[PDB]
Design a protein around this ligand. Structure first.
Ligand SMILES: *[C@@H]1O[C@H](CO)[C@@H](O[C@@H]2O[C@H](CO)[C@@H](O)[C@H](O)[C@H]2NC(C)=O)[C@H](O)[C@H]1NC(C)=O
Ligand SMILES: *[C@@H]1O[C@H](CO)[C@@H](O[C@@H]2O[C@H](CO)[C@@H](O)[C@H](O)[C@H]2NC(C)=O)[C@H](O)[C@H]1NC(C)=O
Ligand SMILES: *[C@@H]1O[C@H](CO)[C@@H](O)[C@H](O)[C@H]1NC(C)=O
Ligand SMILES: *[C@@H]1O[C@H](CO)[C@@H](O)[C@H](O)[C@H]1NC(C)=O
Ligand SMILES: *[C@@H]1O[C@H](CO)[C@@H](O)[C@H](O)[C@H]1NC(C)=O
Ligand SMILES: *[C@@H]1O[C@H](CO)[C@@H](O)[C@H](O)[C@H]1NC(C)=O
Ligand SMILES: *[C@@H]1O[C@H](CO)[C@@H](O)[C@H](O)[C@H]1NC(C)=O
Ligand SMILES: *[C@@H]1O[C@H](CO)[C@@H](O)[C@H](O)[C@H]1NC(C)=O
Ligand SMILES: *[C@@H]1O[C@H](CO)[C@@H](O)[C@H](O)[C@H]1NC(C)=O
Ligand SMILES: *[C@@H]1O[C@H](CO)[C@@H](O)[C@H](O)[C@H]1NC(C)=O
Ligand SMILES: *[C@@H]1O[C@H](CO)[C@@H](O)[C@H](O)[C@H]1NC(C)=O
Ligand SMILES: *[C@@H]1O[C@H](CO)[C@@H](O)[C@H](O)[C@H]1NC(C)=O
Ligand SMILES: *[C@@H]1O[C@H](CO)[C@@H](O)[C@H](O)[C@H]1NC(C)=O
Ligand SMILES: *[C@@H]1O[C@H](CO)[C@@H](O)[C@H](O)[C@H]1NC(C)=O
Ligand SMILES: [Ca+2]
Ligand SMILES: [Ca+2]
Ligand SMILES: [Ca+2]
Ligand SMILES: [Ca+2]
Ligand SMILES: [Ca+2]
Ligand SMILES: [Ca+2]
Ligand SMILES: [Ca+2]
Ligand SMILES: [Ca+2]
Lengths: 401, 401, 401, 401
């Protein structure tokens, strides 16, 4: 006993997250964090970032993000550089803190990324390399533990949000192939950073990108982005053996952006305004769905949470509850799910939470640069309120003039 | 034993603050900290802050503050934004350090706030949302544990100083209603971040805002701000069961600002110059009172500690001891109590301390911005000295010209 | 056993430094650190500092320093402000790191200071208040534990270097009275931050300021600064009961600055060029002395270590070894002793070390500001080499033009 | 048991790295880190650095570097100062983070350096002093533990990469003498920072500089830089008793820079383009070699890994595998080996890794300054990809115009 407990004592945790509880009952969303990254970066030394997803360990939640190694208001924030560049790096800082070289931990070299914590150590996945042969480097506790190479030679890419950990194994989804047609999609089961299983989904006429995956009662649910021909979001669920089912959110409250106005939906891809999209998320609650989506159907502007009690399986456009998150005239962007496990909260259920990226700059504003700040909310079964928590930076910046 | 001790070992504390000792005997105030926030922020990257209250754990004391996510000498420090904005965040740094995005921990999204440490974990309370439906989000150890929604739909607001913890439960006061007339006041008892009890005080003709609450011998004493019709400060005391008594400081040494010149007082609200006020504090010592107050009766200038041996219950304007803190020609501002518990100090009594916010900028100076720096003092039973420890920034700044 | 060891485990050390070993045999000085504070602060956000003394805990050595809450190249570094100001604060950072608001721990409000570590916790002493009634605030583990008020009402002042800890008690020297005549000098013995004993030395015709004190074989030796009428340095030694002896370094290698050229010395104050001085240090080795001193006899320029095998008791001007530290044409300044205890090094003897402050700016240069950077060396019994490790900042700065 | 385990518990490790395993089988190199130091330092406060070698403890890998105490875009980055200056300091930060005074730990005063971790504590070696009498100061756990003085009085210099630790002893190589002719070379065995053994190699007609040393199966292999008359790299291997063998890499894939075009090689120094060179590395795998080298044979541009299955012993210019690291039109520079021990990775073999310094500025660009950023890769037995990961800073900077 002494010997095993002293080893245990000697930031690595002891027990894996079980991932065996279901989502907590909730009525609304309480605001969890806001970093004011771009407002602070007007003067401070703050990274130009994209995709600030959140993921929690046993002691804290962190914001992971991609950066081009350039600071706001610096000449290198110039958007002349391709998103999939050799300078792109995945890094992480505490939630609610501005992403700075003075507070950000380096995680990986990556222009596409995922990260999660199995209760013992951080798993990070960072994809770099050329478009025709990218490699995901898989680190566990900061040590490289595996690699995954592109298998269709067409931009290997992954979640841009947290992977999902259940009972010592973490799960993620990756896409290889075009972003405007049929592609190839793989589910990976990874233990201690070592890929122990993977399956290629037989998903003809489906399209999966930038999956928001969360654990629920031992299984994993991913709600993703159909960039090909879908204005509703696709989903794939699977158990710990990668036995999977697939579909699209049936609700007529369409979840992607761009999208048509709400009307009768489909449990397959809604082709109207289906091309393009945005990373997003949803929480399945029985046959209902908590949908997070932009307010504008044409631009990435505004954000709302919508409870549709039958949205997972019924095609009508009716719902019960709308909670405002970002006002319709304010910029939003990518959004993603993250969870807080009972091991961290002491609750008996999986707490659902989500983050919203607030994009400022190009293409929609007269700057040389593009960046995002971050807000995030957690679902609670107590009183909540809608509002607008936008980015609030006054553009353009000094570097733009 | 072994298994319970290794669990304990694996920054969370083991034992709650008991809160069962009375205030230490003191004769004066020894200076504890000074951050020079605005002087440093002239060049460094330092937040524009307000309300820098102090609160201590078992290992350190921290300065909590509200910020608009803007830095000194940056264009976003422009005071064009409502105080209750969606950009306002509660954050904290070590005492005496300038509040910077590089040293400040994010706590909550809030334009009104409270925080305290029960001996195990930090409790934070941050109110955000619209004026007609604000929600206090209650986090314990950084995890959302409860919410409290506005019940009069008129700017739910709280202490702007530390809550008080006794025997595992922490206590705070909140106000809902107008700031210029009768409002509604509630006492909350919170355990592990979960509201276990609350009482609405029956306070006709009282006004409570920005309560400075401290524990004393198992009960909680709050000295607050009457913004309606009081130039002396109101007080409310209660036990751990929320049985409460109320009053106003009887001393003719009036504690609010603005206020009349010292004359015979009242144990009810002194209506002369009673409208408006400043957050402040006092320590009840038997039937005497340690009053911390501005020196000017009309502006937020100067600061002094005054020992009135009968001020709690007698209306005369006589006192025995005055210790200077900030000179009469220097800017002061909000002031608040904080305590150091026997668990932290090794003393057998509750140490009283206080912080003073030193406001620079609008409305009283020719800048585009308003901020504060921080000084703080602890009561001791040894030799002390009066002086003036002002902010010392040379205004206006570059951003103002 | 379990219960006491778990408490022990739960950064406070367990055992006090014994302080019972003598100084290690040494032949020379190996360079230990250099911070390049002013060179870095040309662009970075670095404090304007003075008196960067060093002191070591069980895990690290730290540089403590006094700052006016102003940064290099900022308008507030303007030397218009008195040294004994209400803005002066004692802070500390890791040795060899530039002193920045982003890496500096706040210690105390002080314009005169001392600090040391008894093996369990940091003791800090910071003097603030008016010239006619200054108070030293004594903190132990960051908690205020005592105060010491001025007893001659003439600028209470202390070491500006580390106090000396032996067997759980730490010792320091303080001066009250004029800096140009007979003053009053007190030795303090402090346990857990509580002054347990103090003696006023009967030192007619002596003058003690800015004492460099170190422990040696259970006793404490202080080598100080005679600002009245001495160009050699005064010393006072005492045991743990404050039974003391006094004298001046007899060597004709005069240790103060300004001073006359080396000639036959005195074991009393050498009046020639005796007025004024600089903080300095020496190590007594039997009847010999390691003297650290400026190279110029008129300015604070250059620095050398000189081994005089009979300098403690003989008045001749002969010595054996000179090791160059700072070249004669480069600026130096204050210098101080610090020690590394066997508990930290694992040696069986007290390691002697010293730091040199390198002053740049007013009065000797055409700037608006005065600051210092830091070098430091430790004595070793292995091969060493003399050189010049000057400050190396190119003055004046942008703020000066 | 209890007392020894609590002692152990009370960042120092318990067990030394054994160093008894051989190199892991690998097929390629997965990218491990990229710091974007110069791009970030365009605006942020980042050191001008050289030689950013990497070395790992039991908990993390750190980038050590030499700096002149000057920041990018600051006037003190002016290259007017000798490389071997008194301002040069060895410092370290986490891998992949920009080297800033706000995140960099001070290690030593040094213009030549080495560092490694024996599993318990950090060993650092920093050489300072004059060219005719430089002293390496050897610190262990930050405490000075030994000195090594120049023995030929001609620029004592060392690895500029990590030393190699086996079974509690760490090993390094030092050179004293000219950089364009026969010099003197010494192997040092150091335990707890104390030099326990050293041998002067009998190396007529060899030249050793800037050795990249790694442990392998109980012995140490160093691949170094022949600055005298060699365009292939020299190697020296030795056991823990300092019994050594020597040679040059036989492969016609020449590893130094400058060098001739690939042709039939030699197991002695290849005199063609042999003068000068660059710090580099190679991994011996049986009779084959993993060679890391620039792409250009005349300038420090580009970088590639080349697997030559017989390159260690055969002089042919044939190889089997080339993996691109930095493109031919991009600036590279020094390169060095580092290792990850089984104690850190949980593997059963020594993981090989390497870092590349990417030099920007003089002599090859029109700036006043010279600095480097950092990339690094680890060998893996899984899928990899070649690419170009260059520095990516747009030169010149503001300070240059
Ligand atoms: C998920 O599995 C965990 C681990 O088995 C369950 O937690 C344990 O449940 C048992 C039985 O009720 C308790 O006695 C233990 O104290 C629990 N903790 C541990 C660490 O084993 C958990 O209840 C399961 N969650 C469900 C079923 O929702
Ligand atoms: C100073 O005192 C300490 C503490 O008593 C001495 O260290 C102990 O010495 C004894 C007797 O030799 C050893 O058995 C212990 O292991 C030592 N350590 C402790 C923690 O007690 C130390 O040797 C003394 N120094 C001298 C005499 O120079
Ligand atoms: C200590 O180790 C024992 C087995 O040796 C295990 O049963 C126990 O849970 C451990 N205690 C902890 C991890 O607190
Ligand atoms: C504890 O002490 C024992 C006895 O000295 C030793 O064998 C062991 O390695 C130590 N550590 C642990 C983790 O048991
Ligand atoms: C951004 O890049 C373009 C060329 O791609 C250049 O013309 C422009 O000046 C750059 N802007 C800044 C602010 O550096
Ligand atoms: C879950 O974890 C347990 C305990 O480590 C393990 O034995 C089991 O195989 C895992 N799998 C499932 C499907 O529960
Ligand atoms: C408060 O309670 C604790 C725990 O029971 C006790 O040790 C302590 O003495 C009490 N304090 C006072 C002042 O009675
Ligand atoms: C502050 O805001 C006012 C009102 O919008 C504007 O006119 C002014 O230019 C602003 N000042 C700065 C320095 O941004
Ligand atoms: C543990 O405590 C015992 C007494 O209870 C003491 O003798 C022993 O030295 C302690 N061990 C430590 C501090 O490592
Ligand atoms: C260890 O566990 C015992 C038994 O639960 C408990 O009484 C004690 O307070 C714990 N802590 C210590 C430091 O002994
Ligand atoms: C310094 O202060 C003087 C007045 O005391 C003033 O004239 C001068 O402009 C100041 N310099 C700077 C750089 O602020
Ligand atoms: C030294 O420390 C011991 C042990 O704590 C204590 O008993 C003793 O009084 C101290 N004094 C001297 C003079 O050694
Ligand atoms: C190295 O030595 C350790 C300790 O004896 C042993 O456990 C390990 O297996 C050895 N490694 C190899 C590769 O033989
Ligand atoms: C760099 O040094 C040169 C030579 O001393 C000097 O002429 C030049 O002005 C310097 N440049 C800068 C930017 O300081
Ligand atoms: Ca779409
Ligand atoms: Ca519906
Ligand atoms: Ca009032
Ligand atoms: Ca009275
Ligand atoms: Ca003198
Ligand atoms: Ca002599
Ligand atoms: Ca060569
Ligand atoms: Ca070959």
């Amino acid at each position: 006993i002494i010997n095993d407990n002293v080893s245990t004592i000697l930031g690595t945790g002891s027990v894996t997250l079980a991932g065996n509880s279901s989502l907590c009952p909730i009525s609304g969303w309480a605001i969890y964090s806001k970093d004011n990254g771009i407002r602070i970066g007007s003067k401070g030394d703050v990274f130009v970032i994209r995709e600030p997803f959140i993921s929690c360990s046993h002691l804290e939640c962190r914001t992971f993000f991609l950066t081009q190694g350039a600071l706001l208001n610096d000449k290198h924030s110039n958007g002349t550089i391709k998103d999939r560049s050799p300078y792109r790096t995945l890094m992480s800082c505490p939630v609610g803190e501005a992403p700075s070289p003075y507070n950000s931990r380096f995680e990986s070299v990556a222009w596409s990324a995922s990260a999660c914590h199995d209760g013992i150590s951080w798993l990070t996945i960072g994809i770099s390399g050329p478009d025709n042969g990218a490699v995901a480097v898989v680190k566990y506790n900061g040590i490289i533990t595996d690699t995954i190479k592109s298998w269709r030679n067409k931009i290997l890419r992954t979640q841009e949000s947290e992977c999902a950990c259940v009972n010592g194994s973490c799960f993620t989804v990756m896409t290889d192939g075009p972003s405007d047609g049929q592609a190839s999609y793989k589910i990976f089961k990874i233990e201690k950073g070592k890929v122990v299983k993977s399956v290629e989904m037989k998903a003809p006429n489906y399209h999966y990108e930038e999956c928001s995956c969360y654990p629920d009662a031992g299984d994993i649910m991913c709600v993703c982005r159909d960039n090909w021909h879908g204005s509703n979001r696709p989903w794939v669920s699977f158990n710990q053996n990668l036995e999977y089912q697939m579909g699209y959110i049936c609700s007529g409250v369409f979840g992607d952006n761009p999208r048509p106005n709400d009307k009768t939906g489909s449990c397959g891809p809604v082709s109207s305004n289906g091309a393009n999209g945005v990373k997003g998320f949803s929480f399945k609650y029985g046959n209902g769905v908590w949908i997070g989506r932009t307010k504008s159907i044409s631009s990435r502007k505004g954000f709302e949470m919508i409870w549709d009690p039958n949205g997972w399986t019924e095609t009508d456009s009716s719902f019960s509850v709308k909670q405002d998150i970002v006002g319709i005239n304010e910029w939003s962007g990518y959004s993603g799910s993250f969870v807080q496990h009972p091991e961290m909260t002491g609750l008996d259920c999986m707490r659902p939470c989500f983050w919203v990226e607030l994009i400022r700059g190009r293409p929609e504003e007269n700057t040389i640069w593009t960046s995002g700040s971050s807000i995030s909310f957690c679902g609670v079964n107590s009183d909540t309120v809608g509002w607008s928590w936008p980015d609030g930076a006054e553009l353009p910046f000094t570097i733009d003039k």
